[PDB]
Amino acid sequence: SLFSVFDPTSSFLSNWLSMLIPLLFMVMSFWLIPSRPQFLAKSVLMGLNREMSLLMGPASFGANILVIALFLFILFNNFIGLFPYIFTATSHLAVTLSLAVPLWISFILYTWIKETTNALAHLVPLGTPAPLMPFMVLMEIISNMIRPITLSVRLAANMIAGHLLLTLLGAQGTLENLYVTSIVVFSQIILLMLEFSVAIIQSYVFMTLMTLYASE
Amino acid sequence: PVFSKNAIESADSIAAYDSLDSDVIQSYVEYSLASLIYYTMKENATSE
Amino acid sequence: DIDSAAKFIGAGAATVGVAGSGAGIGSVFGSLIIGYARNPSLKQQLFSYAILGFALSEAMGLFCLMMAFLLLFAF
Amino acid sequence: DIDSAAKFIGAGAATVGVAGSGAGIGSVFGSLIIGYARNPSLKQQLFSYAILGFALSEAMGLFCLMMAFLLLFAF
Amino acid sequence: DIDSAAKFIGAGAATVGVAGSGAGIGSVFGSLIIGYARNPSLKQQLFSYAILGFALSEAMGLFCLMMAFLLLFAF
Amino acid sequence: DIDSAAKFIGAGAATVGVAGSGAGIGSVFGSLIIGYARNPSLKQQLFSYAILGFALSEAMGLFCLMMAFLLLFAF
Amino acid sequence: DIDSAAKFIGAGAATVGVAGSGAGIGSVFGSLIIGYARNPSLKQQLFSYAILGFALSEAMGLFCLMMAFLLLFAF
Amino acid sequence: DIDSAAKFIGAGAATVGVAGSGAGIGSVFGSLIIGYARNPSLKQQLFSYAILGFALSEAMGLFCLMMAFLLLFAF
Amino acid sequence: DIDSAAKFIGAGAATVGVAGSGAGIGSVFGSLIIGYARNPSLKQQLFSYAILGFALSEAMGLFCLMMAFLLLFAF
Amino acid sequence: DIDSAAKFIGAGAATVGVAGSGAGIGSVFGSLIIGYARNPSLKQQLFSYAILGFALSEAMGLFCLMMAFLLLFAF
Amino acid sequence: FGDYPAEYNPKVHGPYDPARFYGKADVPLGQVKLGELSQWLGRRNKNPQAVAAAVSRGWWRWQHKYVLPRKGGIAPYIQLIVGCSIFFYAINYGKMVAHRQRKYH
Amino acid sequence: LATFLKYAKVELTPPGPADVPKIQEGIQNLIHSAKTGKWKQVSVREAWLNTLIVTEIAMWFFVGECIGKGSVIGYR
Amino acid sequence: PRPLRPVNPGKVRVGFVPEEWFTFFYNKTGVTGPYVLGAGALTFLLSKEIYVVEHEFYTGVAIAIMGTYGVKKFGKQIADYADKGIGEIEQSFKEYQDSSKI
Amino acid sequence: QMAFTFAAPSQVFYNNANIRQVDVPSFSGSFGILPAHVATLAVLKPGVVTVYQEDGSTKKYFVSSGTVTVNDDSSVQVLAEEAVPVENLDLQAARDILSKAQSDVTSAGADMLKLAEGQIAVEVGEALVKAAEG
Amino acid sequence: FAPPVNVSPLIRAGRYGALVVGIVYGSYRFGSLQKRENEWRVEEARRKVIRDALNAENKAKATREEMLYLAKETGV
Helix, strand or coil, X not given: CCHHHHCCCCCCCCXXXXXXXXXXXXCXXXXXXXXXXXXXXXXXXXXXXXXXXXXXXXXXXXXXXXXXXXXXXXXXXHHCCCCCCCCCHHHCHHHHHHHHHHHHXXXXXXXXXXXXXXXXXXXXXXXXXXXXXXXXXXXXXXXXXXXXXXXXXXXXXXXXXXXXXXXXXXXXXXXXXXXXXXXXXXXXXXXXXXXHHHHHHHHHHHHHHHHHHHHC | CCCCHHHHHCCCHHXXXXXXXXXXXXXXXXXXXXXXXXXXXXXXXXXC | CCHHHHHHHHHHHHHHHHHHHHHHHHHHHHHHHHXXXXXXXXXXXXXXXXXXXXXXXHHHHHHHHHHHHHHHHHC | CHHHHHHHHHHHHHHHHXXXXXXXHHHHHHHHHXXXXXXXXXXXXXXXXXXXXXXXXXXXXXHHHHHHHHHHHHC | CHHHHHHHHHHHHXXXXXXXXXXXXXXXXXXXXXXXXXXXXXXXXXXXXXXXXXXXXXXXXXXXXXXXXXXXXXX | CXXXXXXXXXXXXXXXXXXXXXXXXXXXXXXXXXXXXXXHHHHHHHHHHHHHHHHHHHHHHHHHHHHHHHCCCCC | CHHXXXXXXXXXXXXXXXXXXXXXXXXXXHHHXXXXXXXXXXXXXXXXXXXXHHHHCCHHHHHHHHHHHXXXXXX | CHHHHHHHHHHHHHHHHHHHHHXXXXXXXXXXXXXXXXXXXXXXXXXXXXXXXXXXXXXXXXXXXXXXXXXXXXX | XXXXXXXXHHHXXXXXXXXXXXXXXXXXXXXXXXXXXXXXXXXXXXXXXXXXXXHHHHHHHHHHHHHHHHHHXXX | CHHHHHHHHHHHHHHHHHHHHHHHHHHHHHHHHHHHXXXXXXXXXXXXXXXXXXXXXXXXXXXXXXXXXXXXXXX | CCCCCCCCCCCCCXXXXXXXXXXXXXXXXXXXXXXXXXXXXXXXXXXXXXXXHHHHHHHHXXXXXXXXXXXCCCHHHHHHHHHHHHHHHHHCHHHHHCCCCCCCC | CXXXXXXXXXXXXXXXHHHHHHHHHHHHHHHHHHHCCCCCECCHXXXXXXXXXXXXXXXXXXXXXXXXXXXXXXXX | CCCCCCCCCCCEEXXXXXXXXXXXXXXXXXXXXXXXXXXXXXXXXXXXXXXXXXXXXXXXXXXXXXXXXXXXXXXXXXXXXXXXHHHHHHHHHHHHHHHHHC | CEEEEEECCCCEEEEEEEEEEEEECECCCCEEECCCCXXXXXXXXXXXXXXXXXXXXXXXXXXXXXXXXXXXXCEEEEEECCEEECCCCCHHHHHHHHHHHHHHHHHHCCCXXXXXXXXXXXXXXXXXXXXXXX | CCXXXXXCHHXXXXXXXXXXXXXXXXXXXXXXXXXXXHHHHHHHHHHHHHHHHHHHHXXXXXXXXXXXXXXXXXXX
């Protein structure tokens, strides 16, 4: 029924089991020389760790793994959720808000507690005039306040729109007419390649933005 | 070695060199040839 | 009557959001022309990044068309 | 005939999406001008990319026009 | 009475759509200025490309104006 | 008075088309600044092209303004 | 009674045509920055065009705002 | 039921706001093409900021798409 | 009743015009990034132009948001 | 009950202003790609200008988004 | 909590193989002659810790068969996708049945 | 796929007409296994399989029901 | 006994189905036994509409086509990249042992 | 930390000297050079080169024309024909040169060669006046 | 693959017996439910006519009242 993908109230075993899916798809290491999937997963993680270390800095020892785990959580829910009957956890705004709000609070509160006057000088972007200074302060306060909203919305609303556009094409895929079915399947192949790329891009966007907010 | 404009524009590494039109490369090889001839003239005069 | 009529206005006003897809596609492929003219040896890698920009612009425009079709039929 | 009236407003609102095709075409051929100015020894591939960009931008504009006619007469 | 009112509203909303054609024409002619500045020996081929870009953008703008006049009079 | 009512609304919608002329003129004169900065030895010739871009870009917006008068004192 | 409603909606719709003027002003001053960075020797000539460009990027925009009063109190 | 009809018109009018995100994404990936073709030694690092340029602009357009659900499944 | 309702409609339609101020601000500060990357020794003088662009760009927004509240209450 | 309905229409038309913030953010970060392609050693101050410029442009869009919660609830 | 199970003896059983059951040698369910199947079911305890241990032993047997070998393929990942899609269809049994195409069938 | 067609000819063919007295001797042996034993002496792997096989016979019955009713999805 | 690492994983027919499922029936139903059991199962699910052909079946079909095309096009390249890395690691460990002996 | 070589037929100014930044006036516009700037080439114009030494000292050199070569290893080789320090300039001779250049432009008439000579001398006169005043 | 195996005659006999039973049961049930569907369509035609007449009258009156209310709101 169009929106029936986004109904977690399914049965006695609800659709919240879509969050235990990343425990199944995480590589387990037994032998000393790794297998193909373990080596591929470790190579991707090492590559992203090297990319995020440039933006992090030396005073962010905990940000090596705290953003990588968030990247894998978002990536697995976005990627394995696009398979047909699997519920997509990050489509809902609750899960994305649950990921974005606590780390943003852990950035804002810790920066205010640790360096207060440095943050107040950081409000002025080093050259703006004093009459525009209160406006820049208000701009900085508002822009920091809508940071976790613009992460949760950008992940949840994008995943919802990405699966509703597939559901609209699926509902028009009649089985009696083979021509319409072949058009629907070909257009869904184009759309699903776009959705897989958008899924990985949006997880990388969240990792990059959490790293930038952690360092700043 | 001395290379002309066409021998430089057709090179493999010249695609890595930015802001290159025909006029810039033409002017560059004209002055680079003049500088190389000057350097060879000074060394030849000292050697002679 | 009234609810059925205004769904046409909602769908037509949501159709304007594919103008941004048309502008984004034009900017991507125009700059691909500039990128190719600057460095023709990388035309295989320039075209690969321009396809990504075309895909993301298409993604925004199709999202607007999805909302247009949603208001037109799904309610 | 209020529903037909709302269809006409929806079609008029759906025809603005060709503006994005108009801007994308301008960007493609404006950047074709700059690209041919910089590297006039590759104008066949530049015109190939300009044709591809113009075709994709005009395809988005015709998609907006198709939605402007689909809710007008068909549905 | 309501139908003629909705035709007026749709005609206005369709005549919005020549905005992106105006922007594309502005981008084409500005980029013609830049391309002729960086290479004044090709002022005849670039002007032809500028004419082609402006003709296609004004074609999209006239398509919006055509849809405006069709919704105002034809249906 | 719904006919004159939607005449006012349709005219107000048709006056959005001046925005595209405003952005087109800004892009023409922006590129005139850059094209003068790169090759200032042909400036008046560049200036003539800028006038021609203005002679098109404002004209497109004026056509939308003309449609506002056609929705106010002609139909 | 609905004429006041028509004037309010028409002025509200007519007040979007200055967005394009704002984008043109932003493009002119952006390209003034670039053209001054490239060739800072002709600063008093670049400003001599940019303000002229700014006037022509706003003369159309205020015309839309002129309609936002002409639809509102004059007609 | 004027409330549900104007909620459909409101959601349709708010869905135009994703066009700016589509244009911004296209300009980001277009200037990514230019930046990679000019300095291909930083192909990853430019691409990282290009991905960052894909993020924040999209965070504006999908914000309008949030209202496209807020007026329907929240209000 | 209808007058206050249409004042809400006109104020909502007038608040679109701050989009053009937002785009002009983005073009000004983007080209400030470009211009500073060529002559960083001009990092004050370019920034003065960038502030001047913002001091005009948001002024267009300061017209349109004003043309919301003046339409919402005063007019 | 037309008052609440027109508040919904005004809120929908107010949400269109976030598009221009999205386009301004795209221009800022696209130009960050171009500026970083020519002077990577300045990138931190270049990055700071983006974090300046985007923080202005997005703020203008949020002002329109603030009207989506100001013309909807308080007015 | 992480520790080896109490039946594991590193001086007797060699290195730790988590897919192996180190307890007393009970008859596997495959070769039970079904006349003693109720006795076999009563012999195995139904504690949740033992159930989680049997699930973990089975999951490590599957890891050892399809993932832990060096030149492993994408067959284990397709098995996970199909197994998750079937399970999530059985979870949404009502949500898909209530939108059938035929009536009687 | 030709070998699959070969196996279909070998294995998906109706039984021989001369084995009817034989299979009844088998069927009564199942009756002899329905009263005395020969099923509580069955390894669960084998028992699993015997059930599995039978499910295949019942699925052939539903395939035949699809043949008799024409279309597959429902009774049209 | 000590655990051993086989070079090749378990045998798989039809992309993902294990080969032990197909060879389990060979005592009774031959080679087309399991295949006709799966065919009868799919026909029975689509007959009684236990498996309802919804808007997600065509998503699953498009995923299956994309997955088959992507795996057949990039499986050799990705397996070669991974086995190159594992060989480099094992070579580095062997070089360490030889250098320690020297 | 940029290897900035600045030589001429008359003098050699820097030879692989580590320089923070160089402001080159080129034919493609006056652009600045930092470490790992870009691999471009450039053609000099009559103008002022500003050199930022590692101690923070700023020096200026008028260049008539030459070649600028920024390589991949952050090495810059500006090679003018007649590069002088800007402190060794004459403002009055610059104004006389510019005035004589404008006189030659006026008196060129239909002579395109002398017209080009007058235009070039006008550019040099303007650059010399701006450098002496600057 | 492996060499082919002839199936057990009891398995083949039961499988094709179930196939035949399926064909005749599908024919019988389809013939049975066809009359039931025809009777359901017969009564649903009258139910559709009554529902269509009542709903169209109610929709027309509600549309008239709604248009009168909106004309009252707009003042035209």
